[model samples]
Target chain A: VITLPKLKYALNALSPHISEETLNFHYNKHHAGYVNKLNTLIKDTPFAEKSLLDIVKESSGAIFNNAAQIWNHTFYWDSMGPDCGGEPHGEIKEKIQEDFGSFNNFKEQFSNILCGHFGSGWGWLALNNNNKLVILQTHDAGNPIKDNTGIPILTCDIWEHAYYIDYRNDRASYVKAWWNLVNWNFANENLKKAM
Target chain B: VITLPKLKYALNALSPHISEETLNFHYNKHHAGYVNKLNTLIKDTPFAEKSLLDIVKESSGAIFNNAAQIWNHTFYWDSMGPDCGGEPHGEIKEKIQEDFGSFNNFKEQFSNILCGHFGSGWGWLALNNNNKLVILQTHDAGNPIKDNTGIPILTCDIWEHAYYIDYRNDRASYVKAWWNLVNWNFANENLKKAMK
Candidate 1:
């Protein structure tokens, strides 16, 4: 069964930014590989009918990596679209400004954190019940969805396959370009949905 | 003495992903506070004459918070610029490939380390005497400058004040946006200096 969610736009449309090669490898090879493996692993089990999110919540730990990645990647794809990174421009932006100051200043602190992705993991922009914006970097397939306050705004995948072929060991360049693909419209929608 | 280094770029340059207000508070209130406290703590003493690096090396653990923060903030500011981010090309790239399979796999590991920094500390890309890149993190005023591998290419401070305002408690956003200012040029230059 084709479990992969449909892309809102062609992967290449993210272009010179996320790169067609990277997206294809990430989606087809990496993401698809997980689903194929997951289905094969659970093919005969009664767990097959359970949703991916249910598998993630119940399994957790090592077994959860393959499970959560499938769930996360699906939600992640839907969570963002183009025009994603601008001011939240509402209560979210105002709270960020009030708690942190202005949005412009917050971005510097936020982006430098991209540097903190030591290796293959994900960095998230989330919101608490208080509607405050927060950031977290999950080890392996971890996320606020499982622990702490969770309202994912945008996420950047930091697996080396993300930029190794073109950028090699230079993550800085890949991260800068990654922003271009960040679906700001999608993030705003996420914000609205959560609120 | 204005011993700590100032930011190479303005506070508001990164924008949207990061905010100028965070920088103002972080640099002036947090980073600046560390510099001031370190100077005061070491005033008219033997440490007063020591370079920031020396202070970190000599007084680690015991006075780690002040000393390491002094050095960490300086190195943190020096680690980025406007045109920062991208894989380390040339020798650095080759070294990563040789030692850690390919750069992509290494980044996957690096991202893991960054997220695992926990609270109030840093994550680093360091070089051991064996001349290979290694990733590590420190808790609250920890430093790799005095580690077995005394070389660091890049660092990200994971303290709350470093990102709490904008990211709130979200350490990932702070980690993600940091790519915009990484000083790969400086890190590469440091690699050269270490080899020479």
Candidate 2:
């Protein structure tokens, strides 16, 4: 039976920007809900004893939807922290400059698509097959891992439940505030794994 | 070139079950946003002068996504009312008996799928090719018309934005309340259109 990964930060740590109520549902409810449903779905099946990454990589349809969401939600929790956002200052920083010109430019491009991305999914900054950095938008239950496109460096969910409680339908505002709460260190760690 | 359809009742009419805040965003923002997007997307395209149905049938990608959602949301508003949810009567009643055996059975099956529907979409009762009443689930900008599977008699949006504000992730509770707001009259109206 798969379990929900614990959030690295306290639920209310990112409040005002992402609120305690939002996390209550987004984490305790929606995230755990997927883990529970996937567990029940995989029972007595080929994926029953398999790992989340394994089930996500192999399953299709509903199983893949739930499994990938579990994986994606875990990465999302790691992607932000109470101490995050503002800017980066490391190899990840240098990498963004080399590819997107400056951190602000990357932010512009990322936020533009993140705000405009339609319905129930996430926005990502991942390395392409050529090891070049790129921005990607994955639709409902979509994950970069399943697409075999490239290695995902960092991601932010765009699903309405992620912000509807706080921002209503205003995703642009949520995307703007999100920049102030990003975990550049976690992103840096993922970047290293990609290499 | 398309517009968001006006709600037959005030936003707060379905409150506590489906709150005013939920309707404010679901109707005012998301529904209007899709209609606004469909117009801008088709401004210079061949569909500039075509009907919403025409664009939905002929276009794909962003154009179809917006067009179909506009149509689907409109039908959803018509599917429920302030004076609804006691059990439908008249021809819709007779048809439910003929097709699903009883009103209670149809309600059970309909609510079952409505609550379980995966990600951003709708649950529908439409007439199939053989004119049989069938339940359908359409995902992400899908409309029964485009699928050519059936003529939609009525629909209820299962999109997260449909109830996330009031019900949060508890869609089961939202579905339970919706039964009280079902506009059987509007359903009967759609039922007649199928024969025409």
Candidate 3:
């Protein structure tokens, strides 16, 4: 059975910016719902034993949607922390500067992608085929893993459920506050693994 | 300057089904924000003096988004009433039965459209060019008027903000509850105008 991964921090850990109530619904309800649905759907099928990432990469339609969401939410939870944000450091920092010219420029472009995204989706910082860092947005349950074009380093949930409880319809404000919660450490780890 | 239209009923009129809190935010913040942004966008432009529907049909990019959203939300508010719902009557009902086989079939199909739709958008009961009623879905501020393929008779704002406050992540429940609030009379009027 597919399972909901345990969050690294307490539900209330990322508060003020992302409330405990929002986390309770987003994690326990929405995220867990995908795992539960995926488990039910894949049962008695060849996909039952495949890894979540494998299911994501190989499947289509409902299977692809549910599997990718399961993988994406797990990654999304790790992409932030209780006390994080500011700017990158070490290799990830060097890459951002090299690819985008400056840290400030990278921040602007990334924030704009998150804020300007039109629908329920995700905004990601990923390394493309050439290993150049790029900002991308995916509609609905879309994920970079499905495309085989990039290795995701960071993501911010742009789905309304992700921030409606905390920020209402003010997505721009939610994105602005999300900058404070970004787990740069996690991003650095993903970048290292990608290289 | 573009303005947020006032609701025909009190904020709490649709309560329990769709709470006043939901309307306060949906209408005041979300709907108003679109109009506020539209005015800012159209100032000193050719679109400034055009009607809302004209701007929606003629503009592109951000102007299209804001204009269409403004038009859509205004229609959405009128699509429901405090004591609305049940099957449509008169010419609208006849059209629905002719197009969808029966009222139950229409309800099932429309509910699925509202619930299964992904991302931010709207679900509509529209009259196609052939004058047959059909279920339509538009993604991210898409309006049927822009496509010219259909004339919208009724609509449900399926955007997350439309139902999130009342139903949280349960879009199916919101859609089900919304059935009780649909203004068939308004739909009949729209259908009458379209036929003419």
- Note the clash tally of each candidate: 58, 1, 0
Weakest ten-residue segment in model 3 chain A by summed lDDT: A140-149
Each model's lDDT comes to 0.69, 0.89, 0.89
Q: Candidate 1 chain B: worst 10 consecutive residues by lDDT?
A: B161-170
Residue A179 of model 2: what lDDT? 88
Cα deviation of B47, candidate 3, in Å = 3.2
Candidate 2 structure quality by residue, lDDT tens digits, A1-195: 899999988999887789998998899888998999999899999999999999999999889999999999999889899978898867789999999999999999999999777668899899987878999999998988899877988899998899989998899999988988889998899888897
By DockQ, the candidates rank as 2, 3, 1
DockQ of predictions, in order shown: 0.02, 0.75, 0.69
Provide the TM-score of chain B versus the true chain B for each model in turn. 0.89, 0.97, 0.97
TM-score of 2: 0.97
Give one digit per residue, the lDDT tens place, for model 1 in B18-94: 67876776677667766777777787777887777777888843345677777787787788667767676767788
Deviating ranges (above 4 Å) for candidate 3: A40-49, B44-46
Off by over 4 Å in 1: A1-195, B60-62
Compare the candidates by TM-score and give the number of the best one. Answer: 2
Name the runs in model 2 displaced over 4 angstroms: none
A1-195 per-residue lDDT for model 1 (tens digits): 327767776777666766677677767876886788677766666567787877777765434677778777766666545555445655456656775687667666766777555435677888779877787787557767777568787777665555654565456787777655566566666778776
